[PDB]
Amino acid sequence: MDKNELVQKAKLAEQAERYDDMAACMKSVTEQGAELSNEERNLLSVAYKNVVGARRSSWRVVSSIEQKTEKKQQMAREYREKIETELRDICNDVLSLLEKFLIPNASQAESKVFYLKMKGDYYRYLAEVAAGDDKKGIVDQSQQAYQEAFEISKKEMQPTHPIRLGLALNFSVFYYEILNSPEKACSLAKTAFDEAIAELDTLSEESYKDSTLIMQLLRDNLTLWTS
């Protein structure tokens, strides 16, 4: 279709809770090659987060059953592998949009940070289901995307900006859960919470319901990791 009709069908699919449809509309929009607006890139990001989330949730259930377990073991194993394939195909679709269209046309610091943070997240999803030989390479690609986003946001954004906070939350999850560094995870999260608290007289109407909900999630992670 035409750009504007594609966006409208995506919003409709959103209301119907039909996330595969929503993601195929926003993939087509991205493939036209023009820089996405704020409204468009949030739609793309919501569609893929729901599509990939359903696979990750199913993978954790099946892979655990296969653990606490024979022909019954082999079955769980095969079913975990079919779910893994669906998951990788989804991640590589997103990763390929980021590299061919989104990161090259990103004209502001804020949107470069957004896409680099997305690239860290989707390599991290691959890391969760990787084994042995490929894992080191994949973990490295996640860490470098995160690290470049972290440096740009420190130089260009206020400590209360939602995109800057959201990045610190996910990069600290990476340390804790992928790299096994609880001490670096805690100190990353604590610095982000404290610098935001120091500057609270400076949050607007727009981002001041998003900023404080992420601050809440940072403190909740700390209490969990500290207990």
């Binding site: 919501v46 997240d121 939350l169 999850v173 999630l217 992670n221």
Partner: peptide
């Protein structure tokens, strides 16, 4: 578990 978010 741990909270992440977008």
């Amino acid at each position: 578990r741990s909270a992440s978010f977008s």
